[PDB]
Short mmCIF file of C-alpha atoms and ligand atoms in Angstrom, two decimals:
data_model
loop_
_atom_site.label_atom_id
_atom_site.label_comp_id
_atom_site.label_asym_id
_atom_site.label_seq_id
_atom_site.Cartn_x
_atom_site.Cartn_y
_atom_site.Cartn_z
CA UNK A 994 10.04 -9.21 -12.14
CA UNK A 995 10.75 -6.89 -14.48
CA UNK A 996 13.04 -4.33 -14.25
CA UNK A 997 13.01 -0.98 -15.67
CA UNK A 998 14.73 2.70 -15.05
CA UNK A 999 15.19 4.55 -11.53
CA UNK A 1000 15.79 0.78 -9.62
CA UNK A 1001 12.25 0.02 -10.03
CA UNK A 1002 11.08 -3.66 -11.18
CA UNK A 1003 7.23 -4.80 -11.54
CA UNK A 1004 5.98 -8.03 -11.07
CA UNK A 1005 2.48 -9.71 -12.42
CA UNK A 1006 0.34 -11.56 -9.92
CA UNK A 1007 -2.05 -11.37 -12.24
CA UNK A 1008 -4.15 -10.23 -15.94
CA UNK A 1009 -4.96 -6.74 -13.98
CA UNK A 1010 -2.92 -6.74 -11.12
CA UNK A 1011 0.42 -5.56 -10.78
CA UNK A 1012 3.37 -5.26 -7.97
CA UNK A 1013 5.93 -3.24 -7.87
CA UNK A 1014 9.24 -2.78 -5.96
CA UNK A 1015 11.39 0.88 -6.46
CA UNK A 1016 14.40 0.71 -4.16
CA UNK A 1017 15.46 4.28 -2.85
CA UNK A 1018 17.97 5.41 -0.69
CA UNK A 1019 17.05 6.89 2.96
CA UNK A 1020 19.92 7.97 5.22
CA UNK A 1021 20.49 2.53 3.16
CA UNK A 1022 19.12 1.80 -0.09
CA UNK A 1023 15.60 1.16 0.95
CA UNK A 1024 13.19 -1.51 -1.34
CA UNK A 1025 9.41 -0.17 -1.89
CA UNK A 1026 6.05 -2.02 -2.77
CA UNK A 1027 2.96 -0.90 -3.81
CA UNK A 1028 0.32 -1.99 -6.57
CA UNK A 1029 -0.97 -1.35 -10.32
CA UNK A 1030 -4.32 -2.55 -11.07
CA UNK A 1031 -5.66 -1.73 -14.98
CA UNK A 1032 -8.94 -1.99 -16.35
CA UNK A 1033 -10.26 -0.90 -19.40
CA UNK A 1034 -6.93 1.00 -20.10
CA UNK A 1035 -7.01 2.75 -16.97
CA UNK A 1036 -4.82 2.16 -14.01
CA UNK A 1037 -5.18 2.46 -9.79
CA UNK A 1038 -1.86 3.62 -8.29
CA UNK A 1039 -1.78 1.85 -5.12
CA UNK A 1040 1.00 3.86 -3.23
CA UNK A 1041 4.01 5.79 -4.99
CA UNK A 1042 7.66 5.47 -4.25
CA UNK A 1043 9.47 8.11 -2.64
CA UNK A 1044 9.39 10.42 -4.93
CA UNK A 1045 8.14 12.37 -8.21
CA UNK A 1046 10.74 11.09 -10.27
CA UNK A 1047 10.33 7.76 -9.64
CA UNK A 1048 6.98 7.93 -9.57
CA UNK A 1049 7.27 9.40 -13.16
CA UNK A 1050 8.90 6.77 -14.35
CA UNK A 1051 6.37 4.26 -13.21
CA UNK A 1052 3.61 5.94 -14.75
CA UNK A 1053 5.16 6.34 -17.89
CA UNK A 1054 5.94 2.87 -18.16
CA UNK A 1055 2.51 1.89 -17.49
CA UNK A 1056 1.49 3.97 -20.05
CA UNK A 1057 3.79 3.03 -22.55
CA UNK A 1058 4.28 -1.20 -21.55
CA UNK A 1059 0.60 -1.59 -19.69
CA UNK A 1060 -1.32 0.92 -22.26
CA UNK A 1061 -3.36 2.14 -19.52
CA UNK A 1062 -3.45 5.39 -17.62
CA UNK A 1063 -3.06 6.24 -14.26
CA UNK A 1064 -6.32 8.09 -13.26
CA UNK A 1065 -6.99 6.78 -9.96
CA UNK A 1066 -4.35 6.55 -6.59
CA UNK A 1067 -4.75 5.08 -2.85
CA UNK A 1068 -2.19 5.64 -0.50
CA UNK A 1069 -1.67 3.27 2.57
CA UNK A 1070 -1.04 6.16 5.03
CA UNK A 1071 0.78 9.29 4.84
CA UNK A 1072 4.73 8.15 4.98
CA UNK A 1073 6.81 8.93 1.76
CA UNK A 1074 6.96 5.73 0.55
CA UNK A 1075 3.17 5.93 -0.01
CA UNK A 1076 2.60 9.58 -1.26
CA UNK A 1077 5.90 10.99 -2.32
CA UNK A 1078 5.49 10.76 -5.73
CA UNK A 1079 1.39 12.63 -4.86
CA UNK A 1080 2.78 15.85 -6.53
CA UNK A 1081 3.88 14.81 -10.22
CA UNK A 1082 0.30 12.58 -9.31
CA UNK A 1083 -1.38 15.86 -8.66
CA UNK A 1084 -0.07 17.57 -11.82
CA UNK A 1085 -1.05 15.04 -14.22
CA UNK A 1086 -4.84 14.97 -13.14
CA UNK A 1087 -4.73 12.28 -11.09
CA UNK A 1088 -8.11 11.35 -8.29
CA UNK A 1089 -7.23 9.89 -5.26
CA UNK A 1090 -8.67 8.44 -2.23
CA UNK A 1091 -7.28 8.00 0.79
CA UNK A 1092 -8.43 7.60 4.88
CA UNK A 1093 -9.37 10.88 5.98
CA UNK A 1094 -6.13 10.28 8.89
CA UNK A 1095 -4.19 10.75 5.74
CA UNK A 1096 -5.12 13.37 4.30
CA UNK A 1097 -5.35 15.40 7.62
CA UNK A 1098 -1.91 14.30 8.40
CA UNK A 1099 -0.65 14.96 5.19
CA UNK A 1100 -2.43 17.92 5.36
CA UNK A 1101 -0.86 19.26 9.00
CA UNK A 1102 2.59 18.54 7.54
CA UNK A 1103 2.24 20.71 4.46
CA UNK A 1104 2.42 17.64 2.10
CA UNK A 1105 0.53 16.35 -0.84
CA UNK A 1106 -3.26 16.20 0.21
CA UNK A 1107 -4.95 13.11 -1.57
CA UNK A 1108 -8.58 14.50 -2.49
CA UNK A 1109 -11.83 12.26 -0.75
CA UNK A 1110 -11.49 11.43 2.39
CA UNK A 1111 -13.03 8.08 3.97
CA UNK A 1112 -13.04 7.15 7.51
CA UNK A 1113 -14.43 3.61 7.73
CA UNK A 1114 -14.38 2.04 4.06
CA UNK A 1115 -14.84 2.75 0.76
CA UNK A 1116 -15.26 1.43 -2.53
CA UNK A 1117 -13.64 2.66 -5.59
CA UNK A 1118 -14.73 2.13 -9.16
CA UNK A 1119 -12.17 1.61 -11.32
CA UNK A 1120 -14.42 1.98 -14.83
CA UNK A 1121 -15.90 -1.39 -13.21
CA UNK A 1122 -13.36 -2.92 -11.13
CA UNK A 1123 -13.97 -2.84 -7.41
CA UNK A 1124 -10.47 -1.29 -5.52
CA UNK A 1125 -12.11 -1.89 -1.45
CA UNK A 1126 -10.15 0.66 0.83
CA UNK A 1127 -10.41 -0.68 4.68
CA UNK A 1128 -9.17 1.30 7.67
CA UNK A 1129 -9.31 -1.43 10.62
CA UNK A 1130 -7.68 0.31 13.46
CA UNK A 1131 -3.71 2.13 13.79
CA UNK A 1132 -0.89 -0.30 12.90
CA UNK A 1133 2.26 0.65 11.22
CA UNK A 1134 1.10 4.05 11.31
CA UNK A 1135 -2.26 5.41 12.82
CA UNK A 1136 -3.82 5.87 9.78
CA UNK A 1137 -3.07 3.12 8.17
CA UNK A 1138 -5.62 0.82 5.82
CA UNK A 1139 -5.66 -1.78 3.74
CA UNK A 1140 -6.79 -2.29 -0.12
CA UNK A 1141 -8.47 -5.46 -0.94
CA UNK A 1142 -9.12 -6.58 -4.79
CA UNK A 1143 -12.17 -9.00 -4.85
CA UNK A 1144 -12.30 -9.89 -7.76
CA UNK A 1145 -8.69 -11.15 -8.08
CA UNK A 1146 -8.37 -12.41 -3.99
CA UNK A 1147 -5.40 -10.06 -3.95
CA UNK A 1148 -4.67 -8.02 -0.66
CA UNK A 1149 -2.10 -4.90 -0.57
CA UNK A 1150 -1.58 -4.82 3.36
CA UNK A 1151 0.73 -1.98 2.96
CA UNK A 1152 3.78 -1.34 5.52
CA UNK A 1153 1.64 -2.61 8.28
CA UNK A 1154 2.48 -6.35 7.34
CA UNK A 1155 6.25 -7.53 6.87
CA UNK A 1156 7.20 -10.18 4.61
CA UNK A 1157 8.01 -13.81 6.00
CA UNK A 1158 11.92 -12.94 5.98
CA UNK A 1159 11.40 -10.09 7.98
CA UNK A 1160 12.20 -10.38 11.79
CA UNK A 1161 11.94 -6.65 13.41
CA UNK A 1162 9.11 -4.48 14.03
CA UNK A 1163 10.71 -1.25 12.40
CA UNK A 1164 9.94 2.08 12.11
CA UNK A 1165 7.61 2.90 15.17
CA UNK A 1166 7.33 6.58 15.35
CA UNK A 1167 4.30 6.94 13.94
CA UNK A 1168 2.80 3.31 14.86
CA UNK A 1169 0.44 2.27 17.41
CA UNK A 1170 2.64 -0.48 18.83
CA UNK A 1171 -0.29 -2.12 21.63
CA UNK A 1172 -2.73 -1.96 18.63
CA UNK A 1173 -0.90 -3.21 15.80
CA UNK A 1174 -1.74 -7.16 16.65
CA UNK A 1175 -5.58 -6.18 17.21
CA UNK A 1176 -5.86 -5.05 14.02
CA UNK A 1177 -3.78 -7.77 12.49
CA UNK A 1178 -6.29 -9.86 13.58
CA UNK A 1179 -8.97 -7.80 11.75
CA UNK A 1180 -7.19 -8.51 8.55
CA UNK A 1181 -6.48 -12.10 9.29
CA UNK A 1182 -10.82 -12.57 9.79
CA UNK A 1183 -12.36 -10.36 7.31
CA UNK A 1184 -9.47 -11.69 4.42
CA UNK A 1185 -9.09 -15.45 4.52
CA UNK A 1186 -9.36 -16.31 0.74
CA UNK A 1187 -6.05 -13.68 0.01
CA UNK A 1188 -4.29 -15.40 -2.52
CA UNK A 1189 -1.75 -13.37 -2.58
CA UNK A 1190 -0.82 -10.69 0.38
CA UNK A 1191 1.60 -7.64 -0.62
CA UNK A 1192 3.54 -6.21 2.08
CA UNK A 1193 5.04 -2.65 2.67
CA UNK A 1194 8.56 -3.49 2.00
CA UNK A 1195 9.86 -7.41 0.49
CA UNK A 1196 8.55 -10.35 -0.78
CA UNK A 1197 4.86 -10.88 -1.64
CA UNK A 1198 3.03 -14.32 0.02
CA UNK A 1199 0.16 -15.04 0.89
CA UNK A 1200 -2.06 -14.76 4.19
CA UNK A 1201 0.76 -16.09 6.50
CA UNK A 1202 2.56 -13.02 6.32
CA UNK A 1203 -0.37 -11.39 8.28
CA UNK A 1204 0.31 -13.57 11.76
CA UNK A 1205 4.40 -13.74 11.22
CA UNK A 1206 3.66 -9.39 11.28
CA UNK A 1207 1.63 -10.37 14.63
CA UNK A 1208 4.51 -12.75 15.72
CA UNK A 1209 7.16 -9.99 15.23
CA UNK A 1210 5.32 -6.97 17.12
CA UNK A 1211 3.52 -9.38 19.69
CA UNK A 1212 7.63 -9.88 20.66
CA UNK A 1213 8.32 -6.64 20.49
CA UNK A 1214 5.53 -5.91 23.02
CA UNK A 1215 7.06 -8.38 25.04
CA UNK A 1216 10.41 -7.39 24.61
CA UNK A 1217 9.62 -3.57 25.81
CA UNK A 1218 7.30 -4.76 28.80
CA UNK A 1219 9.72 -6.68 31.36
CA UNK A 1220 11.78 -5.19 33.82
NA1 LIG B 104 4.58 2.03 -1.32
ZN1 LIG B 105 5.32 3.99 6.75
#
């Protein structure tokens, strides 16, 4: 990884494909992920941290370090860790895409609105390279999806997947606890060549992290069932 200003740190999985981790602090300094794909000197913004200044500060590096521009942004679903940093996005031009859920959520709550809305999948164009947005069913958050990178077997699960150090289910209040495992096992069937898997929060891995995510909330079920 490398690290940079406002405790953010980016690490290559790849010639166009980027991760990065921006720690913040909630109530706990919280740690981050989302994604930075670049073709032809532009970049995809998959997710922002939690804010506009951070969120600044990635995009200038990218711009300064990657030479590429931001000119295209995804969000997983509408929690702050995904579109926080949507306004200073807005204001510098930038087209998004997003699951219509999100933006109607976002939209109810008087936040950022990304632009087109999708509700089954969609395929984004990045001057060539192929950015494939998936909604497969309420997870983390009810309108969560998933972006999967083709051409570089690289799959940005968002905070619906936990990394393989991660033992509880977390932040429920927007999830869909009883479907979260079904949809899991979407994921798990339509992406079996992932070479690498990037969660919401901690370490990147590969396709394992996908059933230790359905291991965690299948116990949580079971936890919350018995008498
Ligand atoms: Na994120
Ligand atoms: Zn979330």
């Amino acid at each position: 990884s490398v690290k940079i200003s406002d405790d953010i740190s980016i690490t290559q999985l790849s010639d166009k494909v980027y991760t990065y981790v921006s720690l913040a602090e909630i109530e706990g300094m919280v740690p981050s992920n989302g994604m930075i794909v670049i073709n032809n000197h532009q970049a995809a913004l998959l997710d922002t941290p939690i804010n506009d200044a951070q969120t600044e500060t990635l995009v200038n590096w990218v711009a300064d370090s990657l030479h590429a521009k931001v000119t295209t942004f995804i969000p997983n679903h509408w929690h702050g860790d995904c579109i926080g940093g949507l306004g200073y996005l807005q204001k510098k031009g930038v087209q998004s895409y997003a699951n219509q859920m999100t933006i109607d959520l976002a939209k109810e709550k008087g936040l950022p609105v990304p632009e087109h809305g999708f509700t089954d999948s969609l395929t984004v164009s990045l001057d060539g390279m192929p950015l494939q947005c998936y909604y497969l069913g309420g997870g983390h958050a009810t309108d969560n999806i998933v972006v999967w990178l083709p051409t570089e077997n690289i799959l940005f699960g968002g905070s619906m997947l936990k990394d393989n150090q991660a033992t509880s289910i977390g932040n429920i209040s927007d999830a869909d606890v009883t479907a979260w495992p079904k949809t899991l096992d979407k994921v798990k069937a339509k992406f079996p060549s992932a070479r690498y898997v990037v969660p919401g929060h901690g370490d990147y891995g590969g396709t394992e992290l996908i059933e230790h995510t359905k291991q965690i909330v299948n116990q949580y079920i079971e936890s919350t069932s018995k008498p």
